[PDB]
Design a binder for this molecule. Sequence first.
Ligand code: A1JCG
Ligand code: A1JCG
Ligand code: NAG
Ligand code: NAG
Ligand code: CA
Ligand code: CA
Ligand code: ZN
Ligand code: ZN
Ligand code: ZN
Ligand code: ZN
Lengths: 525, 527
Amino acid sequence: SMWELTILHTNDVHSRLEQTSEDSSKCVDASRCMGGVARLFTKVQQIRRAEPNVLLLDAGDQYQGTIWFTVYKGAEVAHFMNALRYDAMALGNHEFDNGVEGLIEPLLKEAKFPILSANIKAKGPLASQISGLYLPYKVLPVGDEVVGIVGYTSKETPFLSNPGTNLVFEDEITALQPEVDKLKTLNVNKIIALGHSGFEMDKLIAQKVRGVDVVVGGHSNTFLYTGNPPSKEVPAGKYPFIVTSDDGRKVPVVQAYAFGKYLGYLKIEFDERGNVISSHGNPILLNSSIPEDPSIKADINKWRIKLDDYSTQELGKTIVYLDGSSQSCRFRECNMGNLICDAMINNNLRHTDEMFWNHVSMCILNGGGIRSPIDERNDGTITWENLAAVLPFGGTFDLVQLKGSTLKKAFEHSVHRYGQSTGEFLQVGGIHVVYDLSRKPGDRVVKLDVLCTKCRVPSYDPLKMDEVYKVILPNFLANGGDGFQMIKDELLRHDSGDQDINVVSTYISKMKVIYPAVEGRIKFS
Amino acid sequence: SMWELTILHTNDVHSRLEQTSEDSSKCVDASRCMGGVARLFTKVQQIRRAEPNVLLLDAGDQYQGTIWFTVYKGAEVAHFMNALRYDAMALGNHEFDNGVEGLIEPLLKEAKFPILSANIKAKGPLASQISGLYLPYKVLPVGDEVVGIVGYTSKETPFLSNPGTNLVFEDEITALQPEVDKLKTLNVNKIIALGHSGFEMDKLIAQKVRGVDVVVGGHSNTFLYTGNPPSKEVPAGKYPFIVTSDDGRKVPVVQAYAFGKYLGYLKIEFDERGNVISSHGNPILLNSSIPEDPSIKADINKWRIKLDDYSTQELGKTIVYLDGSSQSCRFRECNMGNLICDAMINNNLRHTDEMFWNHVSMCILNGGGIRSPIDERNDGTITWENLAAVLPFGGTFDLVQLKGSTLKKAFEHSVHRYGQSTGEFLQVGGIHVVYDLSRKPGDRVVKLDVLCTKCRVPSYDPLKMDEVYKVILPNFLANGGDGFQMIKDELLRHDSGDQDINVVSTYISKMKVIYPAVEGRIKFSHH
Ligand SMILES: O=P(O)(O)[C@@](CO)(Cc1nn[nH]n1)OC[C@H]1O[C@@H](n2ncc3c(NC4CCCC4)nc(Cl)nc32)[C@H](O)[C@@H]1O
Ligand SMILES: O=P(O)(O)[C@@](CO)(Cc1nn[nH]n1)OC[C@H]1O[C@@H](n2ncc3c(NC4CCCC4)nc(Cl)nc32)[C@H](O)[C@@H]1O
Ligand SMILES: *[C@@H]1O[C@H](CO)[C@@H](O)[C@H](O)[C@H]1NC(C)=O
Ligand SMILES: *[C@@H]1O[C@H](CO)[C@@H](O)[C@H](O)[C@H]1NC(C)=O
Ligand SMILES: [Ca+2]
Ligand SMILES: [Ca+2]
Ligand SMILES: [Zn+2]
Ligand SMILES: [Zn+2]
Ligand SMILES: [Zn+2]
Ligand SMILES: [Zn+2]
């Protein structure tokens, strides 16, 4: 005898409540738009009506990405996930972006489903405050069986978000194994690991955590597919990805890209003792072939009324595609990066009253801070809402004095673990860098020319290690985010800047028509 | 017996009536300013009081370069050259910039000294109109002797200016020799060739034209000096430069850079039969050590009143030196070029109602069209006057559809005679070009990448020969100037654009603070 479970799964939805363009920017041409919570609900109900044993799971990073989260601050997440009737969610890194209070009062108190993390431990006054609002696991009834779901969250969360110093983020394998053993002693024979640490960590969990039957992941924005993929996303492996564990077991690992563009869909056949005997499926592309549910869409429109103040005024026009996609901006020079760096540099030079920074022409910008493209095909209109999708974090473009050796160390860090879509890869202004990736990590920077400052005509001269340079960058990077510890430690001055999104809107308002290009600021050898 | 003559000479003054900064841009810090007509007058008078036999000569290109010429149109040239008591002038190419009417009514009718060119022949109805207003030669009394001065003008004048199709520009050597022979039969044994064809042609004249004793030149902006030079300009040779002629004679050739920064000064010792026994001198740096003459300065201030409309409004600010010097912009990437090209591109995109050119991101700009720097040390203010020194010509930034093969032929022409400070060297926008100069002319372009247009994100892709590109450029280049004959002939569309100086002021007004760099748009390689 066999027992079939259908796992429906989203991850890194990142406040894409409404349907989006193919690239996850704002919907303009409705006939070609994709995803959003109303469309997901239609596909979820289609599966639920057909399959008797169904779990709808989220692997974190619902928080942050559009004006939805800027305005509603997680109430939209609670509300629409409840309307969809998610069975469980794992805490991601972006769930702590508005502090622990930003997690508790909107999401944890209003969610009608369990929220999960087994490697986040609470200490101090916070322990009693957050007791039971999230859990290490939940044991869910599914038909006449039970399925254990055990949660996890990235160890990098303190370095990427605002979880506060009373939350300790343990190792995933060390925290998960006792919980999985606890569930076995409670006669839960089917166990799903649901969490938010990336596809590599998901694979290690599948391997090393004995008793885990399936890993549903997130954080790396990984697309897995078996067969011919339905859109632009290139699959990193088959769906599901099969790990061979330490005790010889085949453990399926899944992820469902990002932005609610796909619904992950895995059918698993279990024996009577909760061993996986087979698995199959694929992520389902939520395109115009699936209608947005009328009820959920009507509710979305009601919540949408408050947001329409942010889409009113045209700040300017683009006549080129502003490529702010992760696949470009984390792997090579992207023109959205160039735009943002040029805006950073240009805005700073209006502050003529402050003479220490009035010649700053160099810029560094973490690629992962660029959160969305903007489309050029609607007479390429750029509103505030469009900008808020690119720059949702409410950071500042701060000013730092750095030694040359600090700067070379940062450019080595930029490509130290290249090829995994991590956000540390640097977009630049007033810098020409050339990488050779065949060299070992810490020695991949082969050419590095920067704009001179003690010179009448600015030209790109080679960077000297002993020389000091002035750079404009996100406060995230100045304070040591993305493992840029050399910046925070070794910087000589650090001034607070202007607000990031205001800098870019000012710049676009000034220029009227923008046309940034890929110029060979970042080259490969 | 011996007879000593002192030749004082200017060339390519280019409307620098007032004193200038070291680089020839507007005077701001008066304590370190140079040249101008008031200072020149002081130095000329010092020499005249000291030496009995003095000629003050001009080798052309007084016309064009600042608002002085924009407003007064050659009347300031006539007026201040007359006040200085120039003995003779040769017609340069820029003397024809406002047509033949622009030469006649201001300069030729009001000048109290002879104006000279022996290789400009007038035909049609214009011949009788301009007969004798300029001359092939003039024979000037100097003390008890006479000195013949014979004129010449660049054969490239029709391709650089607006002389009209009724003026023919003959070969200089063929035109000069009969005049020099004629003067020998008229018992003129001392002959100066004064003209405007460049230092190379000056040397050929010295060599080939039998009877010429001295060549006073212009057009190439050549600095010659003997000893340690007093300023930024690198000497091309000794002063005077000595040609050994075909008929066995040492002929001194002189020039005096440009912009009235130096007064050329050559002492020649002649024998009784008008042969040069020796020559010596140097150009005199007209710096703060020579005071401005009170009379000429007071007259300059009176004429200056009408011009002060052009310097009131600050259009914007630069925080970098805008290198618009000939030594940069005709030899490599200069940031003034980059600025002008970016302004050309940016202004064009405001015309959204016209959909054929609304994605144009490629620009070519002849380096010789960039006429002056702008300084950054006075809180680097940019007025209209400053801009008018960079872009004096009143051209337009026109729009052309060109084949790729046309564009590569233009980039080959850009460096075909590289190393001579000729204006055809191209400043660019949305183009990355790499030259190898060790290769032969017509095959020096080794890499040539341009911004794509049928593409969502613009990147620099290699230029395809069969593919067609849209480019913004000066109408000078579209109409075939600087020997860019491939553009005029092989272009597919040609629309008139906006006025050149208005494009750059609009852009500066928009940007407020400008900081253009040398970016590697133009590189050189030795493979
Ligand atoms: O799953 P994700 O979203 O975690 C992901 C994982 O690699 C993947 C992804 N790809 N596409 N969408 N998602 O990207 C993370 C990258 O994003 C950048 N990052 N994160 C936060 C943040 C920040 N501010 C903080 C401080 C106050 C709360 C927010 N500020 C700036 Cl400038 N960058 C920021 C960084 O590069 C990091 O490596
Ligand atoms: O002695 P010069 O001054 O002749 C000189 C000789 O090599 C030397 C020089 N160096 N520094 N100052 N002088 O430069 C010539 C270069 O100047 C450029 N040039 N000339 C005219 C002109 C023009 N318009 C004209 C057309 C109708 C009347 C106005 N338009 C644009 Cl865009 N360029 C123009 C061109 O490159 C040429 O090669
Ligand atoms: C939607 O996706 C399916 C595959 O999942 C594909 O066959 C279909 O062509 C798509 N429909 C559109 C774009 O309307
Ligand atoms: C002016 O030029 C003379 C002659 O070359 C030189 O000796 C002197 O130093 C200069 N005076 C200045 C810069 O004040
Ligand atoms: Ca099991
Ligand atoms: Ca003689
Ligand atoms: Zn995420
Ligand atoms: Zn994440
Ligand atoms: Zn000239
Ligand atoms: Zn000339």
